[PDB]
């Protein structure tokens, strides 16, 4: 789940488009359609991850949305920007899925955001790794995020792009902050909820070695390749201030809304069961019908 | 990961279900039949049935909610279900 | 009751978790500023 289904073969499609970029740039309609697809995935997966009761799921939808982000990147005639994006994607997204697997193994082989043990007290290394990975996927300056979704966001704000795609990708960045801090204030919140025998402990030396091996890349390799590479992308230096930090402003806006939704669950009152939360918490509302109706129709005409 | 030895879940059942302060510990026992030995029906069992299963890391069968009543029954089902054989 | 005592409960805040030893970052402030300052001063 953390190697394949995070950053190696789910990136294969956008990677193939990158390899086929010289043909891609010739046509611009497919560029707009790829913008639409990469926006709509950053919609569905991210909003479904807004309320997901499983740590694997949230980071998986973070993956899929960010893959749609290089889809947007190849749709705004930036193959190599998407290529740097997959390059540092392999570092950081795998890194957060590493943290997810670590908490899973330590927390009684469980993944739901419910029944956490206030892990930060007893899960420190994973806590720091998860926080910096969360900041990275929400465009942390100088980190992998800066030479990533941050760059792609200022590019899409700069380049002539679909409007709805443009607003959608900042909504996506806000949601990226949202669920990334959701795992933060659920897992390491500080209220223990777990079996009486405390198993949350990263004492395995090899686990520490591997986690830090990917950790240094998620800290360093974000920029240990960004300026070293030959100048290959569009070097837009000047731009309007309000959208100059459009990536940065939507990241901090997502942070503040994220903490707002965090503390709204910290109150004493009852949480809304309305249809909006339902749409939020059933994996984008798409699979449920597709796993039921089309299979029935096809195999019933087979019968 | 422990084998959850008979003494392990045995300690579990003298902390959980001996967690019950509604009945004073002096009349409490591992054979305690809560319906008349303690005077509280299986009703004031099901709630803590849900609590203890949240601790051991297992799910009591919903079909097996009834009759699952005394600490001896707790160790019984835990031992048979968790192959507590050491 | 153990899951309310300070041993496992009462964790630092979510930003506080993010500020994992950020006072060492404030030390990094000074060390980097002084590094550039002595680089420029002696050159």
């Amino acid at each position: 789940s953390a190697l394949l289904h995070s950053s190696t073969m789910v990136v294969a499609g956008v990677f193939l488009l990158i390899r086929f970029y010289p043909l891609m740039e010739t046509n611009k309609l497919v560029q707009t359609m790829t913008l639409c697809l990469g926006a709509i995935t950053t919609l569905f997966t991210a909003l479904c991850a807004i309320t997901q009761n499983d740590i694997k799921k949230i980071v998986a939808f973070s993956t899929s949305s960010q893959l749609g982000l290089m889809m947007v990147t190849i749709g705004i005639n930036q193959p190599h920007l998407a290529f740097l994006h997959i390059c540092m994607h392999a570092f950081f997204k795998a890194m957060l899925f590493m943290c997810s697997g670590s908490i899973i193994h330590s927390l009684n082989d469980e993944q739901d955001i419910r029944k956490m043990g206030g892990l930060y007290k007893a899960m420190p290394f994973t806590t720091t790794a998860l926080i910096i990975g969360s900041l990275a996927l929400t465009g942390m300056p100088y980190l992998t995020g800066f030479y990533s979704k941050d760059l792609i966001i200022e590019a899409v704000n700069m380049s002539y792009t679909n409007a709805w795609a443009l607003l959608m990708t900042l909504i996506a960045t806000s949601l990226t902050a949202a669920y990334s801090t959701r795992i933060i204030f659920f897992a390491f919140l500080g209220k223990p909820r777990f079996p009486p025998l405390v198993l949350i402990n990263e004492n395995n030396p090899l686990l520490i070695n591997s986690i830090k091996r990917l950790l240094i890349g998620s800290i360093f390799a974000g920029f240990i390749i960004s300026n070293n590479i030959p100048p290959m992308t569009v070097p837009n230096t000047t731009m309007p201030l309000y959208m100059k930090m459009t990536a940065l402003i939507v990241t901090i806006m997502g942070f503040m809304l994220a903490l707002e939704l965090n503390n709204t669950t910290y109150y004493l009152k009852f949480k809304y069961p309305s249809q909006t939360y339902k749409f939020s918490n059933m994996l984008g509302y798409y699979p449920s019908i597709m796993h039921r109706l089309p299979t029935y129709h096809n195999l019933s005409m087979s019968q | 990961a422990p084998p959850l030895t008979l003494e392990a879940i045995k300690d579990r059942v003298l902390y959980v279900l001996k967690l019950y302060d509604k009945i004073d510990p002096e009349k409490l026992s591992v054979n305690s039949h809560f319906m008349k030995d303690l005077g509280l029906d299986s009703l004031d069992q099901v709630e803590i049935i849900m609590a203890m299963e949240d601790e051991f890391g297992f799910e009591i069968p919903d079909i097996d909610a009834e009759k699952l009543m005394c600490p001896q029954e707790i160790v019984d089902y835990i031992a048979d279900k968790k192959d507590v054989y050491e | 009751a153990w899951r309310y005592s300070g041993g496992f409960a009462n964790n630092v805040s979510f930003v506080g978790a993010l500020l994992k030893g950020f006072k060492w970052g404030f030390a990094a402030f000074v060390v980097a500023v002084g590094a550039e300052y002595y680089l420029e001063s002696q050159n």
Binding site: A122, P124, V198, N201 | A1, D11 | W2, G7
Partner: peptide, 20 residues
Amino acid sequence: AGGGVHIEPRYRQFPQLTRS
């Protein structure tokens, strides 16, 4: 698996979070 576990469990206590 066997006895003498490194993080050998004191019941409901901090499982020796190594300061290293």
